Amino acid sequence: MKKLQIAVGIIRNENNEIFITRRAADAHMANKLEFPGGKIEMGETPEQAVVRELQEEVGITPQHFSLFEKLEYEFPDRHITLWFWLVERWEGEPWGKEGQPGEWMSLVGLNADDFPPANEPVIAKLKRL
Ligand SMILES: Nc1nc2c([nH]c(=O)n2[C@H]2C[C@H](O)[C@@H](COP(=O)(O)O)O2)c(=O)[nH]1
Ligand SMILES: OC[C@H]1O[C@@](CO)(O[C@H]2O[C@H](CO)[C@@H](O)[C@H](O)[C@H]2O)[C@@H](O)[C@@H]1O
Ligand SMILES: [Mn+2]
Ligand code: NA
């Protein structure tokens, strides 16, 4: 079974909205809503990975961010460790830089069923803010 370290950014604006993208139909966790992010590469740290991933996926540079949650989840065919970074300050304006759908979503309106099941406790904890 594949093992992966994944860094993702919870991008929260001043209006308690989160920038959420939707995964491609032919990807793992196809069509799911997601926090932008991706695999931590060899030779880079989790903090460096979330910066690089958000630059690649949505065109922002996170700064002064914090680790909101770290958890592990066993999917049917892979084991992933997810690093959820809370990103409240950044340079740039997030957009669908890789052609993917992206939009701002109110925190209170998030439905954990729309996300990969690994995100369940994080979406709950975000609504506790
Ligand atoms: N990018 C991202 N990936 C997630 C989230 N939740 C989650 O289980 N994953 C999983 C889906 C993929 O198996 C893997 C990410 O790899 P890619 O983003 O490179 O597809 O992590 C999330 O919120 N954002
Ligand atoms: O791990 C994040 C954690 O560390 C602090 C300092 O105690 O922030 C530092 O690390 C962040 C991630 O690299 C940087 O963005 C930040 O600039 C740096 O001070 C905490 O703020 C944070 O909770
Ligand atoms: Mn990704
Ligand atoms: Na990516």
PDB file of C-alpha atoms and ligand atoms in Angstrom:
ATOM      1  CA  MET A   1       0.000   0.000   0.000  1.00  0.00           C
ATOM      2  CA  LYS A   2       1.279   3.437  -1.053  1.00  0.00           C
ATOM      3  CA  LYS A   3       2.117   5.872   1.770  1.00  0.00           C
ATOM      4  CA  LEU A   4       1.925   9.620   1.127  1.00  0.00           C
ATOM      5  CA  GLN A   5       2.582  12.843   3.040  1.00  0.00           C
ATOM      6  CA  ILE A   6       0.177  15.552   1.816  1.00  0.00           C
ATOM      7  CA  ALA A   7       0.238  19.263   2.710  1.00  0.00           C
ATOM      8  CA  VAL A   8      -2.905  21.340   2.191  1.00  0.00           C
ATOM      9  CA  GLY A   9      -3.842  24.929   2.914  1.00  0.00           C
ATOM     10  CA  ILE A  10      -7.026  26.123   4.614  1.00  0.00           C
ATOM     11  CA  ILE A  11      -7.238  29.576   3.031  1.00  0.00           C
ATOM     12  CA  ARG A  12      -9.521  31.751   5.181  1.00  0.00           C
ATOM     13  CA  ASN A  13     -10.435  35.346   4.364  1.00  0.00           C
ATOM     14  CA  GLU A  14     -11.642  38.109   6.687  1.00  0.00           C
ATOM     15  CA  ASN A  15     -15.286  37.135   6.039  1.00  0.00           C
ATOM     16  CA  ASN A  16     -14.925  33.599   7.464  1.00  0.00           C
ATOM     17  CA  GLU A  17     -14.902  32.096   3.960  1.00  0.00           C
ATOM     18  CA  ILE A  18     -12.523  29.384   2.722  1.00  0.00           C
ATOM     19  CA  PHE A  19     -11.070  29.060  -0.784  1.00  0.00           C
ATOM     20  CA  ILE A  20     -12.114  25.576  -1.934  1.00  0.00           C
ATOM     21  CA  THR A  21     -11.266  23.782  -5.190  1.00  0.00           C
ATOM     22  CA  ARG A  22     -12.873  20.689  -6.731  1.00  0.00           C
ATOM     23  CA  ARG A  23     -10.834  17.644  -7.726  1.00  0.00           C
ATOM     24  CA  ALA A  24     -10.857  16.312 -11.282  1.00  0.00           C
ATOM     25  CA  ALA A  25     -13.197  13.508 -12.307  1.00  0.00           C
ATOM     26  CA  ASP A  26     -10.305  11.121 -13.024  1.00  0.00           C
ATOM     27  CA  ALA A  27      -8.351  11.807  -9.823  1.00  0.00           C
ATOM     28  CA  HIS A  28      -8.249   9.904  -6.572  1.00  0.00           C
ATOM     29  CA  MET A  29     -11.175  11.264  -4.547  1.00  0.00           C
ATOM     30  CA  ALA A  30     -12.683  12.325  -7.863  1.00  0.00           C
ATOM     31  CA  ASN A  31     -15.104  15.297  -7.906  1.00  0.00           C
ATOM     32  CA  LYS A  32     -14.553  15.994  -4.180  1.00  0.00           C
ATOM     33  CA  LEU A  33     -14.163  19.449  -2.727  1.00  0.00           C
ATOM     34  CA  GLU A  34     -10.713  19.992  -1.268  1.00  0.00           C
ATOM     35  CA  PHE A  35      -8.261  22.285   0.381  1.00  0.00           C
ATOM     36  CA  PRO A  36      -5.565  23.047  -2.235  1.00  0.00           C
ATOM     37  CA  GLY A  37      -2.416  21.039  -1.610  1.00  0.00           C
ATOM     38  CA  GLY A  38      -0.382  18.045  -2.656  1.00  0.00           C
ATOM     39  CA  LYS A  39       2.445  15.656  -1.941  1.00  0.00           C
ATOM     40  CA  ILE A  40       5.417  16.688   0.200  1.00  0.00           C
ATOM     41  CA  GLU A  41       8.417  15.994  -1.994  1.00  0.00           C
ATOM     42  CA  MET A  42      11.726  14.479  -0.989  1.00  0.00           C
ATOM     43  CA  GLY A  43      14.039  17.178   0.299  1.00  0.00           C
ATOM     44  CA  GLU A  44      11.286  19.646   1.188  1.00  0.00           C
ATOM     45  CA  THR A  45       9.583  20.259   4.522  1.00  0.00           C
ATOM     46  CA  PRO A  46       5.830  20.229   5.203  1.00  0.00           C
ATOM     47  CA  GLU A  47       5.960  24.034   5.542  1.00  0.00           C
ATOM     48  CA  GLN A  48       7.783  24.357   2.210  1.00  0.00           C
ATOM     49  CA  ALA A  49       5.348  21.937   0.555  1.00  0.00           C
ATOM     50  CA  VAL A  50       2.231  23.919   1.481  1.00  0.00           C
ATOM     51  CA  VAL A  51       3.822  27.123   0.130  1.00  0.00           C
ATOM     52  CA  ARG A  52       4.833  25.446  -3.129  1.00  0.00           C
ATOM     53  CA  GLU A  53       1.503  23.666  -3.556  1.00  0.00           C
ATOM     54  CA  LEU A  54      -0.553  26.819  -3.017  1.00  0.00           C
ATOM     55  CA  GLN A  55       1.695  28.713  -5.434  1.00  0.00           C
ATOM     56  CA  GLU A  56       1.179  25.988  -8.053  1.00  0.00           C
ATOM     57  CA  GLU A  57      -2.523  25.327  -7.548  1.00  0.00           C
ATOM     58  CA  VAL A  58      -4.051  28.726  -6.713  1.00  0.00           C
ATOM     59  CA  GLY A  59      -1.290  31.309  -7.199  1.00  0.00           C
ATOM     60  CA  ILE A  60      -0.817  32.576  -3.638  1.00  0.00           C
ATOM     61  CA  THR A  61       2.148  32.487  -1.266  1.00  0.00           C
ATOM     62  CA  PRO A  62       0.999  31.649   2.275  1.00  0.00           C
ATOM     63  CA  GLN A  63       2.770  33.351   5.147  1.00  0.00           C
ATOM     64  CA  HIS A  64       2.544  33.325   8.948  1.00  0.00           C
ATOM     65  CA  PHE A  65       0.462  30.150   8.800  1.00  0.00           C
ATOM     66  CA  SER A  66       0.009  27.486  11.472  1.00  0.00           C
ATOM     67  CA  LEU A  67      -0.579  23.742  11.648  1.00  0.00           C
ATOM     68  CA  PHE A  68      -4.316  23.380  12.217  1.00  0.00           C
ATOM     69  CA  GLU A  69      -4.375  19.579  12.241  1.00  0.00           C
ATOM     70  CA  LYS A  70      -2.221  16.611  11.296  1.00  0.00           C
ATOM     71  CA  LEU A  71      -3.902  13.272  10.808  1.00  0.00           C
ATOM     72  CA  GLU A  72      -3.588   9.948   9.036  1.00  0.00           C
ATOM     73  CA  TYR A  73      -6.261   8.240   6.973  1.00  0.00           C
ATOM     74  CA  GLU A  74      -6.352   4.770   5.420  1.00  0.00           C
ATOM     75  CA  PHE A  75      -8.115   4.930   2.047  1.00  0.00           C
ATOM     76  CA  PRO A  76      -9.050   1.671   0.273  1.00  0.00           C
ATOM     77  CA  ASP A  77      -5.790   1.627  -1.723  1.00  0.00           C
ATOM     78  CA  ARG A  78      -3.461   4.118  -0.026  1.00  0.00           C
ATOM     79  CA  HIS A  79      -2.426   5.502   3.355  1.00  0.00           C
ATOM     80  CA  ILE A  80      -1.970   9.274   3.583  1.00  0.00           C
ATOM     81  CA  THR A  81      -0.784  11.626   6.305  1.00  0.00           C
ATOM     82  CA  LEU A  82      -2.460  15.026   5.870  1.00  0.00           C
ATOM     83  CA  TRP A  83      -0.968  18.289   7.132  1.00  0.00           C
ATOM     84  CA  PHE A  84      -3.751  20.886   7.370  1.00  0.00           C
ATOM     85  CA  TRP A  85      -2.250  24.386   7.515  1.00  0.00           C
ATOM     86  CA  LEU A  86      -4.452  27.326   8.496  1.00  0.00           C
ATOM     87  CA  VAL A  87      -3.566  30.134   6.071  1.00  0.00           C
ATOM     88  CA  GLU A  88      -4.953  33.524   7.084  1.00  0.00           C
ATOM     89  CA  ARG A  89      -2.322  35.774   5.479  1.00  0.00           C
ATOM     90  CA  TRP A  90      -0.965  35.483   1.947  1.00  0.00           C
ATOM     91  CA  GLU A  91       0.386  37.354  -1.043  1.00  0.00           C
ATOM     92  CA  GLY A  92      -1.827  37.162  -4.129  1.00  0.00           C
ATOM     93  CA  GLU A  93      -5.453  36.422  -4.945  1.00  0.00           C
ATOM     94  CA  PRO A  94      -6.355  32.699  -5.145  1.00  0.00           C
ATOM     95  CA  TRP A  95      -7.773  31.486  -8.447  1.00  0.00           C
ATOM     96  CA  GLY A  96      -8.080  28.328 -10.521  1.00  0.00           C
ATOM     97  CA  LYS A  97      -4.468  28.534 -11.638  1.00  0.00           C
ATOM     98  CA  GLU A  98      -4.462  24.925 -12.888  1.00  0.00           C
ATOM     99  CA  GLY A  99      -7.815  25.308 -14.653  1.00  0.00           C
ATOM    100  CA  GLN A 100      -9.668  23.714 -11.700  1.00  0.00           C
ATOM    101  CA  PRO A 101     -12.883  25.137 -10.188  1.00  0.00           C
ATOM    102  CA  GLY A 102     -12.279  27.243  -7.117  1.00  0.00           C
ATOM    103  CA  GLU A 103     -14.519  29.470  -5.048  1.00  0.00           C
ATOM    104  CA  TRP A 104     -14.963  31.052  -1.646  1.00  0.00           C
ATOM    105  CA  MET A 105     -17.236  29.069   0.670  1.00  0.00           C
ATOM    106  CA  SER A 106     -18.616  30.199   4.007  1.00  0.00           C
ATOM    107  CA  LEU A 107     -17.134  28.178   6.840  1.00  0.00           C
ATOM    108  CA  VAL A 108     -20.568  27.568   8.381  1.00  0.00           C
ATOM    109  CA  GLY A 109     -21.919  26.189   5.102  1.00  0.00           C
ATOM    110  CA  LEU A 110     -19.250  23.538   4.529  1.00  0.00           C
ATOM    111  CA  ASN A 111     -20.596  19.981   4.231  1.00  0.00           C
ATOM    112  CA  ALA A 112     -18.028  17.355   5.212  1.00  0.00           C
ATOM    113  CA  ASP A 113     -19.770  14.917   2.863  1.00  0.00           C
ATOM    114  CA  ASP A 114     -18.516  17.010  -0.081  1.00  0.00           C
ATOM    115  CA  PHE A 115     -14.852  16.438   0.944  1.00  0.00           C
ATOM    116  CA  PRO A 116     -12.700  13.314   1.215  1.00  0.00           C
ATOM    117  CA  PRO A 117     -13.642  11.422   4.381  1.00  0.00           C
ATOM    118  CA  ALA A 118     -10.188  12.138   5.813  1.00  0.00           C
ATOM    119  CA  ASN A 119     -11.248  15.807   6.190  1.00  0.00           C
ATOM    120  CA  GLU A 120     -14.222  15.057   8.512  1.00  0.00           C
ATOM    121  CA  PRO A 121     -12.593  16.036  11.855  1.00  0.00           C
ATOM    122  CA  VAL A 122     -10.927  19.109  10.303  1.00  0.00           C
ATOM    123  CA  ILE A 123     -14.185  20.478   8.875  1.00  0.00           C
ATOM    124  CA  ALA A 124     -15.805  19.908  12.270  1.00  0.00           C
ATOM    125  CA  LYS A 125     -12.975  21.681  14.083  1.00  0.00           C
ATOM    126  CA  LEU A 126     -13.039  24.612  11.653  1.00  0.00           C
ATOM    127  CA  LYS A 127     -16.725  25.133  12.452  1.00  0.00           C
ATOM    128  CA  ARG A 128     -15.697  25.339  16.132  1.00  0.00           C
ATOM    129  CA  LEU A 129     -13.732  28.554  15.423  1.00  0.00           C
TER     130      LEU A 129
HETATM  131  N1  LIG B   1      -5.191  18.446  -2.001  1.00  0.00           N
HETATM  132  C1  LIG B   1      -5.954  17.798  -1.091  1.00  0.00           C
HETATM  133  N2  LIG B   1      -5.849  16.461  -1.014  1.00  0.00           N
HETATM  134  C2  LIG B   1      -6.590  15.773  -0.105  1.00  0.00           C
HETATM  135  C3  LIG B   1      -7.458  16.460   0.751  1.00  0.00           C
HETATM  136  N3  LIG B   1      -8.071  15.559   1.562  1.00  0.00           N
HETATM  137  C4  LIG B   1      -7.566  14.384   1.159  1.00  0.00           C
HETATM  138  O1  LIG B   1      -7.903  13.263   1.689  1.00  0.00           O
HETATM  139  N4  LIG B   1      -6.682  14.463   0.170  1.00  0.00           N
HETATM  140  C5  LIG B   1      -5.961  13.349  -0.484  1.00  0.00           C
HETATM  141  C6  LIG B   1      -6.475  13.191  -1.912  1.00  0.00           C
HETATM  142  C7  LIG B   1      -5.266  12.607  -2.616  1.00  0.00           C
HETATM  143  O2  LIG B   1      -5.262  11.194  -2.348  1.00  0.00           O
HETATM  144  C8  LIG B   1      -4.086  13.233  -1.894  1.00  0.00           C
HETATM  145  C9  LIG B   1      -3.572  14.514  -2.555  1.00  0.00           C
HETATM  146  O3  LIG B   1      -2.779  14.230  -3.704  1.00  0.00           O
HETATM  147  P1  LIG B   1      -2.970  15.194  -4.978  1.00  0.00           P
HETATM  148  O4  LIG B   1      -3.550  16.470  -4.403  1.00  0.00           O
HETATM  149  O5  LIG B   1      -1.591  15.321  -5.555  1.00  0.00           O
HETATM  150  O6  LIG B   1      -3.996  14.508  -5.828  1.00  0.00           O
HETATM  151  O7  LIG B   1      -4.565  13.611  -0.607  1.00  0.00           O
HETATM  152  C10 LIG B   1      -7.537  17.841   0.643  1.00  0.00           C
HETATM  153  O8  LIG B   1      -8.303  18.484   1.401  1.00  0.00           O
HETATM  154  N5  LIG B   1      -6.786  18.474  -0.276  1.00  0.00           N
HETATM  155  O1  LIG B   2       4.529  25.566  12.861  1.00  0.00           O
HETATM  156  C1  LIG B   2       3.818  26.774  12.731  1.00  0.00           C
HETATM  157  C2  LIG B   2       3.864  27.505  14.072  1.00  0.00           C
HETATM  158  O2  LIG B   2       5.139  28.105  14.259  1.00  0.00           O
HETATM  159  C3  LIG B   2       4.996  29.513  14.374  1.00  0.00           C
HETATM  160  C4  LIG B   2       6.020  30.091  15.357  1.00  0.00           C
HETATM  161  O3  LIG B   2       5.884  29.469  16.624  1.00  0.00           O
HETATM  162  O4  LIG B   2       5.097  30.111  13.094  1.00  0.00           O
HETATM  163  C5  LIG B   2       6.317  29.905  12.408  1.00  0.00           C
HETATM  164  O5  LIG B   2       6.173  28.889  11.432  1.00  0.00           O
HETATM  165  C6  LIG B   2       5.253  29.163  10.387  1.00  0.00           C
HETATM  166  C7  LIG B   2       5.280  28.001   9.403  1.00  0.00           C
HETATM  167  O6  LIG B   2       6.521  28.003   8.720  1.00  0.00           O
HETATM  168  C8  LIG B   2       5.615  30.455   9.651  1.00  0.00           C
HETATM  169  O7  LIG B   2       4.614  30.732   8.692  1.00  0.00           O
HETATM  170  C9  LIG B   2       5.739  31.601  10.645  1.00  0.00           C
HETATM  171  O8  LIG B   2       6.169  32.783   9.995  1.00  0.00           O
HETATM  172  C10 LIG B   2       6.730  31.221  11.739  1.00  0.00           C
HETATM  173  O9  LIG B   2       6.763  32.258  12.697  1.00  0.00           O
HETATM  174  C11 LIG B   2       3.560  29.739  14.844  1.00  0.00           C
HETATM  175  O10 LIG B   2       3.040  30.983  14.426  1.00  0.00           O
HETATM  176  C12 LIG B   2       2.809  28.608  14.177  1.00  0.00           C
HETATM  177  O11 LIG B   2       1.698  28.229  14.970  1.00  0.00           O
HETATM  178 MN    MN B   3      -3.297  18.658  -5.383  1.00  0.00          MN
HETATM  179 NA    NA B   4      -0.559  19.828  -6.827  1.00  0.00          NA
END
